[PDB]
Design a protein around this ligand. Sequence first.
Ligand SMILES: OC[C@H]1O[C@H](O[C@H]2[C@H](O)[C@@H](O)[C@@H](O)O[C@@H]2CO)[C@H](O)[C@@H](O)[C@@H]1O
Length: 598
Amino acid sequence: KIEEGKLVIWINGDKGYNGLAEVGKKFEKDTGIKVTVEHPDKLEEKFPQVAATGDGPDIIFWAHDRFGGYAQSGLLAEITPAAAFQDKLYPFTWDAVRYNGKLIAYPIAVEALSLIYNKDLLPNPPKTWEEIPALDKELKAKGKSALMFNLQEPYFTWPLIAADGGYAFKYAAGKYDIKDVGVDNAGAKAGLTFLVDLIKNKHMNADTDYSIAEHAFNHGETAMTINGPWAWSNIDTSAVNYGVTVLPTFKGQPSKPFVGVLSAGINAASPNKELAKEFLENYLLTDEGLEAVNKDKPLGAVALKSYEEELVKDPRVAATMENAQKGEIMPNIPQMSAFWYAVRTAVINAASGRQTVDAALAAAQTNAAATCSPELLMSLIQTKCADDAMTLVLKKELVAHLKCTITGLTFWDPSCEAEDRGDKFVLRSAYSSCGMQVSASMISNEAVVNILSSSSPQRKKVHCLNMDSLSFQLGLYLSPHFLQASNTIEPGQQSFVQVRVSPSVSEFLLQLDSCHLDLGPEGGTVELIQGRAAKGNCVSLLSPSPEGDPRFSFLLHFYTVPIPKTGTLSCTVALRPKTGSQDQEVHRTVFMRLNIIS
Ligand SMILES: OC[C@H]1O[C@H](O[C@H]2[C@H](O)[C@@H](O)[C@@H](O)O[C@@H]2CO)[C@H](O)[C@@H](O)[C@@H]1O
């Protein structure tokens, strides 16, 4: 699923991703968190397909209308901005991203279509739609056209459809009524008919799309176009001398564009939600962050109050707000996708001439209304830590409960593959083999699991303790207190032993499996500890040090003389991770030579 530790962003290609990536770069320097900005095609329709399966970006940028459908499906995570932060943005933007009383996304910018015109060609654009035919006429004699804009997305045709009273859904009793659809109303039929009449009269071409309309205006083929703020950049790359003004009226009524609020939602499956929040609130939403995106591609009106006040001075931004006020914010209801899909058809079918305006719009109103559980799998993988080797074991029975078929299990080195013993899957590697990593006094690798259900590999971090890195020493103390002389031992006097390891391992639990004192030939061997417990009345276990160092006490009695001159204390220590099971427990033996005297 989503990669843990990194932020993946999806945004439409027309919007500045480069300016956004430059915001992420600033985020990397301070927090060292790499931000990947991508712009796939059909990210709005692609996101819900992948997100439902757990795959997708950590953050998605789109108009607000799509986020309610995502929300109602459970693909978005409710954002939790502080009241002090919400006041920094205009209240109406928070209304766009509010769903079921929850905030499902962060509003970024307010987007509304405007009329862009060529000043060199047309210093004073027409005030109304009705006079475009008379305009286009004057231009065609010069080998040009009055207006070109994308007819394949109803977003661009809606301003004319809603000018006479066309509407997607009526708002009553505080909610959008999905049974009541305004596509077939005479206001829409009047707008769409006007569009068709422009195509029939040759004033526009039905096949026109976005990239053709953008190429035509920037290259001087047409005097006017309808687009959003994002497009002003490429017009600047071009030398076109242009201006942004309010959309022309229709039947005396202003053109009502559907106003989207560019918003950043957080994936419901993303583990990084905290990072997404820290990035969006602290960095992306700011005077600087928004300016960085605006330099690459214009955002137009912004949700942030402070930065907005500066942007409103821009004539182009003032023109976008003027068009927004005359427009209606898009409903965020899940039904919008069916509405948009249905309206796109009617515009294309009616503009193509395949259907009459009444027949096309009437049909649109009808359509508008309209097992593996691999996360558990990794838990079954057991890490066995031997002295020289690490072995991974996966019980077959447990796998059966999960209903998964494992295609492969390996270490980092693909050469090392698990072997099937028929009751379990075992994978053994030497600490120096299979790309094992020796660091931090630990031997770490990853178990790469491939399941038939998912193409992507599953990775689980495995670790074993490296005892060669650790240094073991045997202390001996005359009293139950720290003392500097461990070398000499005396009979009949209590002796206290402490096992010290450097670098001290606090994470691991220390226990003494066995201890022995070897008096050599003729002296015999005395068993101080066995079976993890003290042996005999002369030995008793003590409490460990503040450090993990274990401790025990023993009393040494000799009946006869000569006393053994020298002896060696042997103690076998067991090391288990506080976070690990017994499988990962490792054992080492420590020896020390000591002088016995009396
Ligand atoms: O055309 C239907 C389409 O309209 C909106 O998409 C806009 C978007 O709001 C703008 O920010 C920009 O990306 O242009 C898009 C049109 O291609 C809706 O947001 C979208 O759901 C809908 O399909």
